[PDB]
Amino acid sequence: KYSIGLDIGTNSVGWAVITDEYKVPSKKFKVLGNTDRHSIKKNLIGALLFDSGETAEATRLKRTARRRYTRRKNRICYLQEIFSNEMAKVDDSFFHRLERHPIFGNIVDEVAYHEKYPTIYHLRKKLVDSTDKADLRLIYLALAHMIKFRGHFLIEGDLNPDNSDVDKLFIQLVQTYNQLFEENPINASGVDAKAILSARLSKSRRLENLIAQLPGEKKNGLFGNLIALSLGLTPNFKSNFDLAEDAKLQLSKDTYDDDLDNLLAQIGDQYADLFLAAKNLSDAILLSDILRKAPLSASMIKRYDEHHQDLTLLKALVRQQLPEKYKEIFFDQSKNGYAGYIDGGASQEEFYKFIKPILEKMDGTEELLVKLNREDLLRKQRTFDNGSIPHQIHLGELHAILRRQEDFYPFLKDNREKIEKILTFRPNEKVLPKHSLLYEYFTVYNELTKVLSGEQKKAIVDLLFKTNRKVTVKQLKEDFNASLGTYHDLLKIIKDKDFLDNEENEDILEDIVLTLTLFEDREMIEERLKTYAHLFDDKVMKQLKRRRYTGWGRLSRKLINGIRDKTILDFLKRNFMQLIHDDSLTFKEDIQKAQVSDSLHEHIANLAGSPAIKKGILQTVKVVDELVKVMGRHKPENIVIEMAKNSRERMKRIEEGIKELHPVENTQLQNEKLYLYYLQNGRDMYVDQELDINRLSDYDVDHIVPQSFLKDDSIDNKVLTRKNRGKSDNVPSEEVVKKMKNYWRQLLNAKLITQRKFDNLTKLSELDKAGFIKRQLVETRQITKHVAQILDSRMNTKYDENDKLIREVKVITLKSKLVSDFRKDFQFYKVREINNYHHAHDAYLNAVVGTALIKKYPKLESEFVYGDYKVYDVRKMIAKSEQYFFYSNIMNFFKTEITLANGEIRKRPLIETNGETGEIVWDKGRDFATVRKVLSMPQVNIVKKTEVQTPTVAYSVLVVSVKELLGITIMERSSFEKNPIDFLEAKGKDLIIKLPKYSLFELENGRKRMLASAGELQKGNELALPSKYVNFLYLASHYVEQHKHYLDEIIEQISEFSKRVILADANLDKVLSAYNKHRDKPIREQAENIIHLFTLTNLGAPAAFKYFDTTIDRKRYTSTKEVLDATLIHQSITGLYETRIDLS
């Protein structure tokens, strides 16, 4: 019955709820405060504002080595379960043995394994290529290595030749680069990237070679650095972005993702896709190499073999021609020779610089020198050249091995899909040995829990189970399956009852029995036992080795003794199962959570993005959850999501242009008309009659491919005209005018117009239109796709009997431009500064436009809705003039009237419907009115998220001889969470009243405060400005004039607001005084400055601002005494559920 709209930014999340006719519901919510307000009516439209500070959430959103470790561990734990019962037949202690440390339980097998498989890739390759049956352990090892280091998931489908095409991905890179720099694109022309990047030369040389194809681009240029990143090098991006500190990037470096995030935080998340493109390019360069069995494993083996051939050669040479240097090069390890390279800490570059001269002086062989130049001489296994691998390549080998060994092992046939799913997927402890002292003890105690008093139990163990290997019932009566069989074993060897009986040693002995169970070979057992040798007599040590155990229990050590409350072992010494199943006791609670004992945060943490955007993404999810529960747990039909020098570049272009063939400074060039005046050298694009400044700009401007086919408001599609002379009919600028073109082409050589613009100017097929539609609907930005996926996953959980996913909720991703342009055409104007309502209004508009679009064109669903849907043939939807659309602009149906380029007019029906389903999508009479009404209403839930920090106060608490506010350091809080009263008393009781940062209080004529600190307050109010004034300000700023009397009204409004809530008398007087002086100023200049005046009224920290010549310094609310008698308001994330406190 409803849909959700979402606007997502780095410090805000806008949200709206919408019905079938685009109305925003009103709802009554209960108010849980002690105040005599019990319900409140609120509209389901709002915005959540958040800071980017040090908090628990923030840490949870960062990558951590431990989370990764646990992830991998779990995957392997799942792998081993599939192998368990079958591995039990081959090698019962195999998975317990695994992390030189031995894989196998006997030395013969271990040594043989390492001799046959010097690297894991040898094993992989052999398992991929051999038809012979293989030991299960080997199979496991290969599979486990594949699953452990599965690679990346950047590529969506089963690998195809486009994925390894250097040319195409290079083109992609340039494309994404060009979209981010409209003014100075790079031309792919006919560059043979493939040949330059794939060629076998130095990285630097390949870079330098590639840039030779790009004229006017420097090596240290952004693009050059990106290429250098894709090639394998470590470029520095600080010079490119004017960063204060160093920003070096290397794809091969383990910290790269984090480093990239670090960069993105500074320069903006808008640049993520640009670097992702570079990474993709890198992958292609590597992929084409391994492709031109198991190609990866083979390449690694080749690397290994080359390495050893070269090593032997080099050694021989150095023995022959430079014996003095031999010991140095191959053994010293503190030098930069081969020894330092392998077992020292030496760079490939340090090593190379070290041996470069030695090889040249030697003259034995230059082949090696060539290899050195290529940086392919003595490669190590522990590298990939600026790379993490596509998981698909590991998947291939996985499949191959399984297919190879499935005939010999049926359980592999049966579980194949399962095993694949582990790699592709997107208690903790291992059981004690069966003959462990602790386990044996547990069994006897648990069996003996009943036949009995706690003291007697201990007596009975100490008496019968201890003195006798097996205790029987007759014997018991004189004074039982479970036996302390190991306790007794170890007595005869150790011959010391205390050593056992003392509990402090148990943690040592567990290791001894474990060691005995782990290995079937005296040598190994000895080696491990050597560590505990000092306690033990040498006659004992020899005896210990012969003892061997071959079993595994069902329970872990921590389960038996690790868990709290007494332990299981202690409660036992009731009944174990009953102990597990009692809610009164803590274990049950421990276990149940312990199995699970965060995934969403972890998932968001591994996206490529700043901390802020990640926080945003996190908040959205919570907002959605709450809105769903607000709407009675019914799920929404649709969710629409959107993610919320240049002047100086323009100059460079112009200056570059005139160099081929009066002056203005930069700041002005933002005027499209002036910038266009300069790009064109004051010449009319369309009539060969020169353009001079003051009039013709005002005359007109024109789109090259009109608005009706698509909206391209970029200068790449725009030109300054006389707009009838050039355009003629709607088709691109008419044939008769192309006789003008020589002009344009000169402007091409000058780089004054781009190639595409010229192609369009010289130029409409069905095919173009088809491209044009997809262009306007498909969001390229990766992060939005990830957000979409996350939302879709949370919303759609149920599967039907056919195991197909049930999609209750469609997650729609909207291009920003559609809503921006929707705002343009129908005059729903935005002014960011008056309040924060625009974030909410954006969300509302997103949902409106999105839902309208799916209702109108459901066949295009595949282009902007998450999930897999049929990709219809666009050509069928395009029509001849009379028969969705002949005119390609998708937003056209909103308009009552489409103006063609020639000026001719196409009229549309008042009500727009879907012909196929007959559904009503848009009613121009009612619906636009509703939109305005929705934007016009003054009650919008704006919530500033409360934050707890982790000399900084985590939060302030209200204390009650007197009422006072008290800050809490992070250091103080822990013991405070332990020992409240003694803190509170040491400093100087009903109420625990932690006031998180930004806590909201209200007082007087609806005047609220936010608690920044126990020392300062922030304004707590949103100034609701009537829409008329908003539109007037937008229109006044963007140069009718009969509406000059509204300025005074706006200022009167601001002043009313300020005197009511801001309470900045001295500041306001100056503000008001300033307006009196500058009535003379023109309207534009007049309007722009009243905008700045809004920072006086803005919600948040007080700040300073300049009105014309005058400057108003900020005022701080340094007294927190107001808050103490005020009414606190605890806000939900949506702000819909409130709790209102006021002791007074």
PDB file of N, CA and C in Angstrom, residues 273-304:
ATOM      1  N   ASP A 273      34.646   5.092  -8.049  1.00  0.00           N
ATOM      2  CA  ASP A 273      34.498   4.350  -9.295  1.00  0.00           C
ATOM      3  C   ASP A 273      35.703   4.504 -10.219  1.00  0.00           C
ATOM      4  N   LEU A 274      36.339   5.665 -10.141  1.00  0.00           N
ATOM      5  CA  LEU A 274      37.512   5.960 -10.947  1.00  0.00           C
ATOM      6  C   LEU A 274      38.660   5.008 -10.603  1.00  0.00           C
ATOM      7  N   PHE A 275      38.867   4.786  -9.309  1.00  0.00           N
ATOM      8  CA  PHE A 275      39.903   3.868  -8.843  1.00  0.00           C
ATOM      9  C   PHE A 275      39.500   2.412  -9.047  1.00  0.00           C
ATOM     10  N   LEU A 276      38.215   2.126  -8.864  1.00  0.00           N
ATOM     11  CA  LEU A 276      37.712   0.789  -9.150  1.00  0.00           C
ATOM     12  C   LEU A 276      37.989   0.414 -10.610  1.00  0.00           C
ATOM     13  N   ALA A 277      37.777   1.361 -11.521  1.00  0.00           N
ATOM     14  CA  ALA A 277      38.111   1.142 -12.928  1.00  0.00           C
ATOM     15  C   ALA A 277      39.588   0.771 -13.127  1.00  0.00           C
ATOM     16  N   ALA A 278      40.471   1.484 -12.433  1.00  0.00           N
ATOM     17  CA  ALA A 278      41.903   1.213 -12.501  1.00  0.00           C
ATOM     18  C   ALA A 278      42.196  -0.207 -12.027  1.00  0.00           C
ATOM     19  N   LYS A 279      41.598  -0.584 -10.901  1.00  0.00           N
ATOM     20  CA  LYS A 279      41.779  -1.939 -10.393  1.00  0.00           C
ATOM     21  C   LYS A 279      41.324  -2.971 -11.431  1.00  0.00           C
ATOM     22  N   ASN A 280      40.135  -2.766 -11.993  1.00  0.00           N
ATOM     23  CA  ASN A 280      39.646  -3.653 -13.046  1.00  0.00           C
ATOM     24  C   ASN A 280      40.647  -3.778 -14.199  1.00  0.00           C
ATOM     25  N   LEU A 281      41.172  -2.639 -14.645  1.00  0.00           N
ATOM     26  CA  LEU A 281      42.187  -2.628 -15.694  1.00  0.00           C
ATOM     27  C   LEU A 281      43.380  -3.507 -15.310  1.00  0.00           C
ATOM     28  N   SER A 282      43.879  -3.308 -14.092  1.00  0.00           N
ATOM     29  CA  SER A 282      44.975  -4.123 -13.567  1.00  0.00           C
ATOM     30  C   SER A 282      44.652  -5.616 -13.683  1.00  0.00           C
ATOM     31  N   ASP A 283      43.474  -5.990 -13.187  1.00  0.00           N
ATOM     32  CA  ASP A 283      43.035  -7.381 -13.270  1.00  0.00           C
ATOM     33  C   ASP A 283      43.054  -7.884 -14.704  1.00  0.00           C
ATOM     34  N   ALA A 284      42.562  -7.077 -15.638  1.00  0.00           N
ATOM     35  CA  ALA A 284      42.611  -7.464 -17.047  1.00  0.00           C
ATOM     36  C   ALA A 284      44.047  -7.704 -17.518  1.00  0.00           C
ATOM     37  N   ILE A 285      44.945  -6.775 -17.202  1.00  0.00           N
ATOM     38  CA  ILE A 285      46.346  -6.936 -17.581  1.00  0.00           C
ATOM     39  C   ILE A 285      46.921  -8.249 -17.052  1.00  0.00           C
ATOM     40  N   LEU A 286      46.611  -8.590 -15.804  1.00  0.00           N
ATOM     41  CA  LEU A 286      47.072  -9.868 -15.251  1.00  0.00           C
ATOM     42  C   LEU A 286      46.367 -11.084 -15.874  1.00  0.00           C
ATOM     43  N   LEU A 287      45.070 -10.937 -16.108  1.00  0.00           N
ATOM     44  CA  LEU A 287      44.240 -12.035 -16.586  1.00  0.00           C
ATOM     45  C   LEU A 287      44.658 -12.445 -17.996  1.00  0.00           C
ATOM     46  N   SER A 288      44.877 -11.460 -18.864  1.00  0.00           N
ATOM     47  CA  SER A 288      45.327 -11.749 -20.220  1.00  0.00           C
ATOM     48  C   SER A 288      46.677 -12.456 -20.181  1.00  0.00           C
ATOM     49  N   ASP A 289      47.491 -12.122 -19.183  1.00  0.00           N
ATOM     50  CA  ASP A 289      48.800 -12.748 -19.030  1.00  0.00           C
ATOM     51  C   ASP A 289      48.682 -14.210 -18.613  1.00  0.00           C
ATOM     52  N   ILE A 290      47.897 -14.493 -17.574  1.00  0.00           N
ATOM     53  CA  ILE A 290      47.735 -15.893 -17.164  1.00  0.00           C
ATOM     54  C   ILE A 290      47.002 -16.731 -18.211  1.00  0.00           C
ATOM     55  N   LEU A 291      46.083 -16.118 -18.956  1.00  0.00           N
ATOM     56  CA  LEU A 291      45.416 -16.828 -20.049  1.00  0.00           C
ATOM     57  C   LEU A 291      46.321 -16.975 -21.270  1.00  0.00           C
ATOM     58  N   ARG A 292      47.218 -16.016 -21.472  1.00  0.00           N
ATOM     59  CA  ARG A 292      48.170 -16.076 -22.577  1.00  0.00           C
ATOM     60  C   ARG A 292      49.460 -15.342 -22.222  1.00  0.00           C
ATOM     61  N   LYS A 293      43.604 -26.460 -18.154  1.00  0.00           N
ATOM     62  CA  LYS A 293      44.190 -26.810 -16.867  1.00  0.00           C
ATOM     63  C   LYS A 293      43.809 -25.756 -15.823  1.00  0.00           C
ATOM     64  N   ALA A 294      44.766 -25.400 -14.972  1.00  0.00           N
ATOM     65  CA  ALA A 294      44.613 -24.312 -14.021  1.00  0.00           C
ATOM     66  C   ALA A 294      45.636 -23.238 -14.394  1.00  0.00           C
ATOM     67  N   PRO A 295      45.205 -22.181 -15.113  1.00  0.00           N
ATOM     68  CA  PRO A 295      46.193 -21.212 -15.611  1.00  0.00           C
ATOM     69  C   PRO A 295      46.981 -20.510 -14.496  1.00  0.00           C
ATOM     70  N   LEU A 296      46.304 -20.151 -13.409  1.00  0.00           N
ATOM     71  CA  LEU A 296      46.965 -19.487 -12.290  1.00  0.00           C
ATOM     72  C   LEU A 296      48.059 -20.373 -11.700  1.00  0.00           C
ATOM     73  N   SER A 297      47.666 -21.564 -11.251  1.00  0.00           N
ATOM     74  CA  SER A 297      48.595 -22.502 -10.633  1.00  0.00           C
ATOM     75  C   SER A 297      49.796 -22.740 -11.537  1.00  0.00           C
ATOM     76  N   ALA A 298      49.521 -22.940 -12.821  1.00  0.00           N
ATOM     77  CA  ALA A 298      50.571 -23.116 -13.816  1.00  0.00           C
ATOM     78  C   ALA A 298      51.506 -21.912 -13.865  1.00  0.00           C
ATOM     79  N   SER A 299      50.947 -20.703 -13.904  1.00  0.00           N
ATOM     80  CA  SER A 299      51.787 -19.505 -13.917  1.00  0.00           C
ATOM     81  C   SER A 299      52.658 -19.426 -12.665  1.00  0.00           C
ATOM     82  N   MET A 300      52.090 -19.759 -11.510  1.00  0.00           N
ATOM     83  CA  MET A 300      52.876 -19.782 -10.275  1.00  0.00           C
ATOM     84  C   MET A 300      54.004 -20.818 -10.367  1.00  0.00           C
ATOM     85  N   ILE A 301      53.685 -22.011 -10.861  1.00  0.00           N
ATOM     86  CA  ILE A 301      54.695 -23.057 -11.016  1.00  0.00           C
ATOM     87  C   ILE A 301      55.791 -22.602 -11.980  1.00  0.00           C
ATOM     88  N   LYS A 302      55.396 -21.915 -13.047  1.00  0.00           N
ATOM     89  CA  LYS A 302      56.362 -21.404 -14.014  1.00  0.00           C
ATOM     90  C   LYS A 302      57.263 -20.369 -13.355  1.00  0.00           C
ATOM     91  N   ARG A 303      56.658 -19.471 -12.585  1.00  0.00           N
ATOM     92  CA  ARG A 303      57.414 -18.494 -11.814  1.00  0.00           C
ATOM     93  C   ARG A 303      58.456 -19.205 -10.950  1.00  0.00           C
ATOM     94  N   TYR A 304      57.998 -20.197 -10.192  1.00  0.00           N
ATOM     95  CA  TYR A 304      58.862 -20.999  -9.323  1.00  0.00           C
ATOM     96  C   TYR A 304      60.034 -21.644 -10.093  1.00  0.00           C
TER      97      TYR A 304
END
